[PDB]
Design a binder for this molecule. Structure first.
Ligand SMILES: CC(C)[C@]12O[C@H]1[C@@H]1O[C@]13[C@]1(O[C@H]1C[C@H]1C4=C(CC[C@@]13C)C(=O)OC4)[C@@H]2O
Ligand SMILES: CC(C)[C@]12O[C@H]1[C@@H]1O[C@]13[C@]1(O[C@H]1C[C@H]1C4=C(CC[C@@]13C)C(=O)OC4)[C@@H]2O
Ligand SMILES: CC(C)[C@]12O[C@H]1[C@@H]1O[C@]13[C@]1(O[C@H]1C[C@H]1C4=C(CC[C@@]13C)C(=O)OC4)[C@@H]2O
Ligand SMILES: CC(C)[C@]12O[C@H]1[C@@H]1O[C@]13[C@]1(O[C@H]1C[C@H]1C4=C(CC[C@@]13C)C(=O)OC4)[C@@H]2O
Ligand SMILES: [Mg+2]
Ligand SMILES: [Mg+2]
Ligand SMILES: [Mg+2]
Ligand SMILES: [Mg+2]
Lengths: 105, 104, 110, 104
């Protein structure tokens, strides 16, 4: 299994910044607003799993549709938040992976 | 302001699965474990912000170090979760954005 | 006078009420700890959705719209119900655990 | 299994309000501050469970952590309800009525 090669994280940051700036929403995207929107989307992701004990690759296409959306909503707000904080998220993830290799040899 | 072009979401998925297999951690990466690890990291992000009543850009280097690392972990667990579910996260994001444009 | 909670239901009352609600529907079989935990997370997220675009500033939640206030009451209530259920399902005596946490907090912040 | 009869929710609110007043902390207890701190405590609870594909069979130290994090979540939920002037025990009764109509 693997992801498609695109959109990348930068693609996602650009599409969302453009989406938001065309609608004059950037004035609502203070960090703590985006962090709570993230929390709320993580909450909608959790509602999909809450009555489903470990035993999603076998869910129906329809309930995998709801899962794709909620995973996407989390990612979009996470990218918005990181960008609002001037954090280069793909490089931060390489720095974190490097730390993890050294901590767990 | 922008992000660097690499690693990609698929880059991240790969690095972390190899990292996890090499340590026989796959066995702990059932969907709901990864969902709850994601929740734990979002909480660590909230603890950074909880008493910042009403600017990350001009935060101290230690706080910016904490922010970068927690945002990274959220993204890693999110990618790993989506892979464990066999969801193509980049295309799903693109579908969602269309939904978002149709809704607004 | 100054603001107060009502005296009932207590935490034990809520545990009983919720257990009866589940028993009436045959739902206890779905109330494994990790199920209730993720249910709590979903409700915490619905609470966050009420506040996400609302910057802090008096008057605050007390000056919200009637339906916004109703949604706040229902969301705070939902978090509490699943917390009680989770604690009960883990065999945690929540009222006494609170007393014990308040002593921990007094030592940490003398 | 049952809960002890005390402290009630009103007891918890008073104890925490006096604890906060004594330390001059009520100035930091804006609603979104308390909400984010609640989110943080929920994350710590998530962490006790994340790698656990039963709580009663957990070690005494893990059960101690579980008691403490459940209690933290409850104190911040209480603090937030009060800061919002929500009579939390009565709201619960209304909520149970709502649930009975949603699920006849
Ligand atoms: C005032 C109230 C009726 C209100 O809820 C708020 C917010 O102002 C928004 C809202 O319109 C909705 C759509 C929101 C949206 C944002 C940014 C902010 C929102 C614009 C985002 O990130 O995605 C969705 C509505 O007017
Ligand atoms: C199968 C799927 C569409 C499903 O979602 C699940 C769960 O099985 C439930 C569900 O009916 C809904 C409502 C749920 C409910 C419970 C416990 C379990 C639920 C019964 C609870 O705690 O409050 C609400 C539906 O069948
Ligand atoms: C058994 C207990 C002491 C235990 O907590 C568990 C889990 O087994 C882990 C743990 O070792 C820690 C590190 C964990 C790690 C994971 C995946 C699973 C963990 C391996 C991950 O992706 O992030 C880091 C520890 O032994
Ligand atoms: C400035 C920073 C290092 C700072 O973190 C903030 C907050 O001001 C607090 C803090 O001191 C810690 C303890 C905090 C506390 C509160 C209320 C607010 C806190 C007082 C609460 O509810 O429980 C714990 C520190 O100065
Ligand atoms: Mg959503
Ligand atoms: Mg972390
Ligand atoms: Mg609800
Ligand atoms: Mg804690």
């Amino acid at each position: 299994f693997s992801f498609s090669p695109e959109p990348t994280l930068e693609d996602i940051r650009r599409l969302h910044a453009e989406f938001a700036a065309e609608r004059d929403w950037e004035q609502f995207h203070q960090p703590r607003n985006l962090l709570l929107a993230l929390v709320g989307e993580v909450g909608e992701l959790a509602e999909l799993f809450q009555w489903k004990t470990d035993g999603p690759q076998g869910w129906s296409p329809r309930e995998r549709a709801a899962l794709q959306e909620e995973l996407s909503d989390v990612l979009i707000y996470l990218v918005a938040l990181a960008a609002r904080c001037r954090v280069d998220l793909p490089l931060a993830v390489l720095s974190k992976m490097d730390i993890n290799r050294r901590r767990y040899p």
